[PDB]
Amino acid sequence: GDFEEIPEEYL
Amino acid sequence: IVEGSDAEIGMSPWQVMLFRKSPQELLCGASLISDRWVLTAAHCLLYPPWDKNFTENDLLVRIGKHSRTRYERNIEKISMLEKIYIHPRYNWRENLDRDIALMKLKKPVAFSDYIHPVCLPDRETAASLLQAGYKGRVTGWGNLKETGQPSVLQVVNLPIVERPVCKDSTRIRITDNMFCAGYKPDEGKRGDACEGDSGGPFVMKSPFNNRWYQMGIVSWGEGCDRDGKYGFYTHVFRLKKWIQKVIDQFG
Amino acid sequence: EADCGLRPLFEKKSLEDKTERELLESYI
Ligand SMILES: N[C@H](Cc1ccccc1)C(=O)N1CCC[C@H]1C(=O)NCc1cc(Cl)ccn1
Ligand SMILES: *[C@@H]1O[C@H](CO)[C@@H](O)[C@H](O)[C@H]1NC(C)=O
Ligand code: NA
Ligand code: NA
Numbered sequence: 001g002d003f004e005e006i007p008e009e010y011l
Numbered sequence: 012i013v014e015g016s017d018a019e020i021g022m023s024p025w026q027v028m029l030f031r032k033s034p035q036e037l038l039c040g041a042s043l044i045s046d047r048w049v050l051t052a053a054h055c056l057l058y059p060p061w062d063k064n065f066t067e068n069d070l071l072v073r074i075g076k077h078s079r080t081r082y083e084r085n086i087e088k089i090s091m092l093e094k095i096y097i098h099p100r101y102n103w104r105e106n107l108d109r110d111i112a113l114m115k116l117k118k119p120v121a122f123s124d125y126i127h128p129v130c131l132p133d134r135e136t137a138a139s140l141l142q143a144g145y146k147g148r149v150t151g152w153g154n155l156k157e158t159g160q161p162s163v164l165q166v167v168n169l170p171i172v173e174r175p176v177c178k179d180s181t182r183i184r185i186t187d188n189m190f191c192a193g194y195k196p197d198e199g200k201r202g203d204a205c206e207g208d209s210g211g212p213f214v215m216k217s218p219f220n221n222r223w224y225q226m227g228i229v230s231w232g233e234g235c236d237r238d239g240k241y242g243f244y245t246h247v248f249r250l251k252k253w254i255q256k257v258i259d260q261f262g
Numbered sequence: 263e264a265d266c267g268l269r270p271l272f273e274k275k276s277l278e279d280k281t282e283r284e285l286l287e288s289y290i
Contacts, residue, residue: 001036007082021270021271124271130263146288
């Protein structure tokens with residue numbers, strides 16, 4: 001889990 | 012990708028990352044074939060031996076990316092899936108025959124310097140380009156070695172291998188819906204797709220109209236970049252009629 | 263799709279990428 005968080009809108 | 016190189020910016024603007032929502036992780040590669048359709052390997056979405064069976068809401072598509080892990084603000088676009096279509100005769104039980112799937116996006120993606128669709132081959136282009144020795148290009152964010160991860164998109168050029176050589180390299184039954192690519196042991200050069208590159212495009216640049224065509228989909232291999240082994244790719248043209256039927260009916 | 267396979271940062275500007283020539287040379 002070395003991924004930068006994506007904007008909440010997409011989740 | 013094993014033994015490849017960093018992609019240049021905008022070098023593969025059709026490259027798509029399939030991204031799992033929870034936990035957040037790379038699932039597979041894929042490719043953009045129009046503003047609303049993404050092509051990938053069936054086994055990226057459905058593979059019962061490993062309890063893999065993703066639904067539309069499990070996934071996101073990330074387009075225009077270069078960095079593997081970064082959120083590339085103002086550059087990448089992230090899309091939700093409307094519907095997944097897996098080939099009806101995809102053979103997951105045996106050899107991954109017909110390893111191909113389409114994904115329809117909820118909304119059209121905007122093209123940009125970093126986002127642009129690849130062409131799908133017509134019969135003539137396939138006949139002309141799919142020849143032993145002719146090189147294609149494979150791209151992805153998969154493992155750099157069989158047994159870490161790249162910072163950015165990786166690229167490698169690989170020659171198509173003669174069918175008898177492909178068949179003689181493996182105990183797996185190979186079908187007309189697959190081709191193999193990679194260097195022979197004596198050729199000196201190497202390179203291969205690896206875990207995480209599945210679903211990504213094998214592309215060739217037509218010397219006739221100077222356009223890029225996706226001839227293959229990264230499908231399977233035994234290990235990565237092993238001497239005497241080759242990567243196997245779904246033969247996109249052989250499955251084109253199914254692709255068109257899906258896009259025609261559901262487009 | 264009329265514009266498919268032509269990259270904005272390469273073909274559209276007549277710039278070549280660093281290894282595409284390797285592909286062309288293999289199309290004998
Ligand atoms: N190791 C298996 C070989 C195999 C082949 C047919 C049927 C079952 C198992 C494999 O590649 N895969 C089993 C699951 C999906 C696929 C894979 O990992 N594919 C990634 C890949 C692709 C390529 Cl071209 C080179 C290296 N690794
Ligand atoms: C995969 O998921 C869908 C929905 O849950 C299900 O209908 C299907 O039977 C599952 N297994 C497959 C396609 O092998
Ligand atoms: Na064999
Ligand atoms: Na090999």
